[PDB]
């Protein structure tokens, strides 16, 4: 369902996130192994607070990423990966104009599930953009999140439905190499004056990297653009040192929400990051 849901009154959390990149494969290709973790291990999600003793069905499907509302991603589909040295997790594949996997959640294992049968398929853009109803162009649109749900039946016969999504994931071979990307920011806010160092940690940061700041209305209109001065004198491998810029109207009396992004050339920019300035 593209219908919203939450972390719940209990909690379904992702204990081990996926790697930032995962070149997915087409139908015209040999399948790739299912998504892995940065440690070489695998992604892990479990249900906390399940004081009961019956196996449920955790389902996963490839959702959208970027700064939009979570929605099953139309240009990508989960793929049941073949096998491992040890049959780790079993699967079940179904649809609804988009495939969905269901790996059993065992109480025996603390309602924890190691995801290693989750691969990703890529569909031809022109193939999708065809069906009437679709308004999103696939070009340049290559990011994703692994979405997981669980339906907890209750003693009252109720269904508390939970859902969670991983961190964005790049699937585009080229994009994964070209487009920069923040995964950690040192600070989330500060006051109007700015002039404070924010440590930005991510991938593909070069010496062409510039950090831009934006102000937009609910109207979707850019109201402000300010470039920050990142210490390009010397630094570590992949992490920029950003000097937060002063806000346009230092006289605000209520917190403003802004965005900033990293850019390496006209068409090589990161996804919009969040930031907020506080009044004085």
């Amino acid at each position: 369902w593209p219908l919203s849901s939450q972390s719940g009154s209990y909690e379904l959390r992702i204990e081990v996130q996926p790697k930032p990149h995962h070149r997915a494969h087409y139908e015209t290709e040999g399948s790739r192994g299912a998504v892995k973790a940065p440690t070489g291990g695998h992604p892990v999600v479990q249900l906390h607070g399940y004081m009961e003793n019956k196996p449920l069905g955790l389902q996963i499907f490839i959702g959208t990423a970027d700064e939009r509302i979570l929605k099953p991603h139309a240009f990508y589909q989960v793929h049941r990966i073949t096998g491992k040295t040890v049959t780790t997790t079993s699967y079940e594949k179904i649809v609804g104009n988009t495939k969905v996997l269901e790996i059993p959640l065992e109480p025996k294992n603390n309602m924890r599930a190691t995801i290693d049968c989750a691969g990703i398929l890529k569909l031809r853009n022109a193939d999708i953009e065809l069906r009437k109803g679709e308004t999103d162009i696939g070009r340049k649109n290559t990011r994703v999140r692994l979405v997981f749900r669980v339906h907890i039946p209750e003693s009252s016969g109720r269904i508390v439905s939970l859902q969670t999504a991983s961190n964005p994931i790049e699937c585009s071979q080229r994009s994964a190499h070209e487009l920069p990307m923040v995964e950690r920011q040192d600070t989330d806010s500060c006051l109007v004056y700015g002039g404070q160092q924010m440590i930005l940690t991510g991938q593909n940061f070069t010496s062409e990297s510039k950090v831009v700041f934006t102000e937009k209305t609910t109207d979707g209109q850019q109201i402000w653009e300010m470039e920050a001065t990142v210490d390009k004198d010397k630094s570590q491998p992949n992490m920029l040192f950003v000097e937060i810029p002063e806000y346009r109207n230092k006289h605000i009396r209520t917190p403003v929400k802004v965005n900033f992004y990293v850019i390496n050339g006209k068409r090589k920019r990161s996804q919009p990051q969040h930031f907020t300035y506080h009044p004085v």
Binding site: S4, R68, I69, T135, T218, D219, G220
Partner: protein
Amino acid sequence: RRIRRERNKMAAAKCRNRRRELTDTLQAETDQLEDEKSALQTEIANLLKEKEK
């Protein structure tokens, strides 16, 4: 009369910028409405949880 090109240059550019800004705006609009829509949906689900005590 090579200026003819300099101008037709902008002429074309103009029109092109027009069709872009237009479509970007639209993309903005739909994206926002989806924002609004989900907010209602989550609310509605919050009231149904609230209701059925």
